[PDB]
């Protein structure tokens, strides 16, 4: 089985709820005075105050008018007020009958764990919306942290935020060793999460009276959603391969080439860890043999380095660098080497995935010893081939590719593309945030039908949810259209614009440009943190399971599950898709979004976002 969602819809339409409305000649103290007395939930907007029951024993003030009415469906002012009132009523009943506590933006609800000096509480988060005259409540389960020791530049007291008597607990203020334990403890499975949410939510509705729900309101059939299953697209290496892994194991890359590498080796591998010199040569020979088997000619240049004579680019000058550095120095963020590596890689790249550390060398030695191939000449072809064949069937194999792909993207190499064209012809992506959602430097990408990059331009400013300037947006759109025209000798007939976040730009300018060049277009918003979860329920074994490529569709909104994570990492996080323009069918939009996410050419494991809004810097 049964599709589920962390959502629930009441059987009472928003225009059949009777409310008391008071108008005053915005006002904030009036609500507080009326809420302290008579102990009732309220809401306000501007000078208007809305409540569910008639207020009695007023502290003061004389409203211009008092009414017992319904609301106006078409009034944007009377809908946000009712949403606020419903959310406040839910918080009221949760805080009274369920003993929850309003902290920050969520409600602490119970106790789960304590690690060292940190208590971990589970907090529920509620969202109320009015869509097609129906009230829908969505909810999320998160975790909040609190230090246990009391004081004998930021301070906090429960919900009271005296930020500048115990201190606050945040990921920024965590100790280096506490982060790993906290992240491990926060991890929850699909069944644990989707049962802990449902238990508390269905306890909430037992003590609620203003709205009524079905006995089983969490099924997607009770929410107006429609289920869809999407097939996995094929990829192209030199023919049609069903899976990326199969192509990487027994295929030739889409584009080859030659690479000159300035290998960066740290001396600490010898002074402290006692690693033999020939081991580095053996590892490099293995990598070169694999690359030559893939059709890429890795050519070696070593560069034993320390902190002297850095002078910005130390010895590399924006060339491809193979990194050898100890994990103990990698963990230390204060080290200049880690900062330089981050600057060379960028925000999108993860530092620890493409860097060879002593742990990788130790695993290579363990494999070599355990298979009786610890002594082989690097220059011997048969020995290297046997080592490759041994490593092909191990779990270490992935790691090797995580390095090779790492030096393939940065060297202007395209490993694979899509084997079939999408429904649209060109994709323009505007990425102004990290993968989790936190803001970062902006980037505009242009992608063809089968996923090959066309153009890429930086975007400055846009620090926090700001509309892009009209002049800059027009210049960028014209530049990308001209780039496509130059490369393809034509003009696109359909362009999809993927936006990271909410669309705040001037749609009239886009319409004018598209009509000037006679190009049809669509605008789609992708939300990376929908704060929702989706799963299937099996009653025979009574568990919840997430299946990759699953679509829930309602109106012009959709939820997409595009990953299949293991039970060890956690639970799959969905993607929200919203269509603004109505030019193309929305199912085709969802399918294109799903297909563009199979272009994780930077890493061996599948990514969550489409490549339009998740792409490396050049």
């Amino acid at each position: 089985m049964e599709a589920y969602i962390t959502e629930m819809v009441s059987r009472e339409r928003a225009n059949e709820l009777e409310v008391y409305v008071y108008v005053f000649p915005g006002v904030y103290h009036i609500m507080r005075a009326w809420q302290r007395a008579n102990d009732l939930p309220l809401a306000y907007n501007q000078h208007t105050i809305m409540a569910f029951s008639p207020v009695r024993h007023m502290c003061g003030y004389t409203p211009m008018e008092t009414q017992k009415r319904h609301i106006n469906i078409d009034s944007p002012f009377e809908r946000a007020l009712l949403e606020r009132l419903i959310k406040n009523s839910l918080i009221f009943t949760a805080e009274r009958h369920l003993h929850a506590k309003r902290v920050g933006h969520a409600l602490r609800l119970n106790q789960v764990q304590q690690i060292r000096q940190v208590i971990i509480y589970e907090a529920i988060e509620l969202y109320v919306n009015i869509i097609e005259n129906r009230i829908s409540i969505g909810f999320h389960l998160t975790h909040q942290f609190e230090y246990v020791y009391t004081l004998q530049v930021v301070h906090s007291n429960g919900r009271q935020h005296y930020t500048y008597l115990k201190p606050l607990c945040t990921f920024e203020t965590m100790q280096p060793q506490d982060v790993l334990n906290v992240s491990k403890c926060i991890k929850l499975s699909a069944s644990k999460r989707m049962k802990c949410t449902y238990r508390w939510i269905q306890q909430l509705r037992a003590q609620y009276r203003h709205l009524t729900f079905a006995p089983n309101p969490f099924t997607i059939a009770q929410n107006g959603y429609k289920l869809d299953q999407l097939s996995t697209p094929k990829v192209h290496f030199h023919r049609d391969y069903a899976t990326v892994v199969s192509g990487m194991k027994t295929g030739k890359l889409y584009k080859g080439g030659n690479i000159k590498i300035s290998v960066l080796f740290d001396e600490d591998f010898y002074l402290k860890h006692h690693i033999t010199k020939k081991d580095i040569y053996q590892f490099i020979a293995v990598l070169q043999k694999i690359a030559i088997a893939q059709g890429v000619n890795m050519t070696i240049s070593f560069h034993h380095f320390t902190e002297e004579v850095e002078a910005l680019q130390p010895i590399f000058a924006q060339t491809t660098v193979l990194a050898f550095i100890t994990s103990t120095h990698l963990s230390n963020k204060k080290t200049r080497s880690y900062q330089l590596l981050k600057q060379y890689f960028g925000g999108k790249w993860d530092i620890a995935s493409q860097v060879i550390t002593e742990k990788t060398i130790e695993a290579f030695q363990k494999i070599l010893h355990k298979h009786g191939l610890k002594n082989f000449y690097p220059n011997d072809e048969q020995h290297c081939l046997r080592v490759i064949d041994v490593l092909k069937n191990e779990s270490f194999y992935y790691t090797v590719m995580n390095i090779l792909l790492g030096v393939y993207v940065k060297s202007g190499i395209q490993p694979w593309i899509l084997a079939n064209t999408t429904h649209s012809d060109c994709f323009i992506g505007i990425d102004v945030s990290h993968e989790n959602g936190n803001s970062a430097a902006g980037m505009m990408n242009v992608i063809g039908s089968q996923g090959h990059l066309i153009q890429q331009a930086p975007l400055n400013g846009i620090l926090a949810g700001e509309k892009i300037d009209d002049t800059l947006l027009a210049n960028l759109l014209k530049q990308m259209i001209k780039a496509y025209h130059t490369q393809f000798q034509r003009f696109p007939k359909h362009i999809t614009i993927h936006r990271d976040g909410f669309w705040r730009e001037h749609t009239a300018l886009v319409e004018k440009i598209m009509s000037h060049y006679e190009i049809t277009y669509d605008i789609v918003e992708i939300i990376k943190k929908p704060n929702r979860r989706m799963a299937f329920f099996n009653s025979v074994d009574n568990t919840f399971s997430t299946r990759q490529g699953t679509v829930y569709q309602r109106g012009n909104e959709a939820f997409l599950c595009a990953t299949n994570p293991q039970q060890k990492v956690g639970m799959a996080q969905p993607i929200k898709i919203h269509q603004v323009t109505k030019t193309l069918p929305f199912s085709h939009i969802i399918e294109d979004v799903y297909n563009l996410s199979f272009l994780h050419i930077h890493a061996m494991n599948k990514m969550r976002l489409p490549a339009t809004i998740h792409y490396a810097d050049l």
Side-chain angles (χ1 to χ4, degrees), residues 253 255-263 291 295-299 316-322 344-345 349 354 403-415 453 601-602 615-618:
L253 290 204
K255 200 175 76 64
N258 294 44
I259 297 89
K260 267 74 190 176
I261 297 169
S262 307
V263 298
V296 175
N297 284 51
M298 293 177 70
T299 300
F316 68 101
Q318 302 281 117
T319 49
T320 312
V321 176
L322 200 62
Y344 164 67
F345 274 119
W349 296 88
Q354 289 102 10
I403 305 163
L404 285 180
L405 287 182
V407 292
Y408 285 178
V409 184
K410 290 189 290 290
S411 285
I413 290 191
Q414 175 77 16
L453 190 81
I601 57 161
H602 68 279
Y615 211 98
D617 195 292
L618 270 160

Side-chain angles (χ1 to χ4, degrees), residues 529-567:
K529 190 87 214 68
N531 274 2
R532 305 280 185 280
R533 302 285 144 139
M534 41 201 292
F536 297 78
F537 178 78
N538 196 15
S539 52
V540 171
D541 70 279
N542 190 309
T543 61
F544 282 98
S545 308
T546 61
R547 182 176 324 162
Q548 177 199 341
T550 295
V551 185
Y552 295 164
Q553 182 199 331
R554 199 177 64 177
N556 59 348
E557 281 168 348
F559 283 114
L560 171 80
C561 203
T563 46
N564 189 358
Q566 293 84 18
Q567 198 157 333

Side-chain angles (χ1 to χ4, degrees), residues 265-282:
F265 187 83
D266 191 12
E267 282 295 327
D268 266 15
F269 271 15
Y270 299 155
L271 313 182
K272 286 175 68 178
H273 296 287
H274 295 286
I275 276 165
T276 174
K277 166 71 168 177
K278 291 177 70 68
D279 196 2
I280 308 302
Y281 287 153
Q282 292 187 348

Side-chain angles (χ1 to χ4, degrees), residues 169-220:
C169 205
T170 49
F171 274 120
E172 189 193 2
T173 63
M174 295 296 172
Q175 277 193 4
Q177 68 271 23
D178 285 334
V179 166
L180 270 298
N181 217 312
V182 161
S183 303
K184 285 192 253 153
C185 295
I186 295 315
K187 187 269 183 181
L188 306 177
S189 300
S191 295
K192 179 165 199 325
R193 160 164 310 248
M194 293 270 288
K195 282 167 175 174
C196 183
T197 58
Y198 287 172
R199 257 206 306 279
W200 198 92
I201 292 300
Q202 206 159 4
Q203 275 175 18
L204 173 75
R205 89 191 204 83
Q207 296 294 321
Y208 202 50
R209 291 137 191 131
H210 301 130
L211 300 146
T212 184
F213 307 88
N216 200 2
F218 305 113
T219 313
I220 57 147

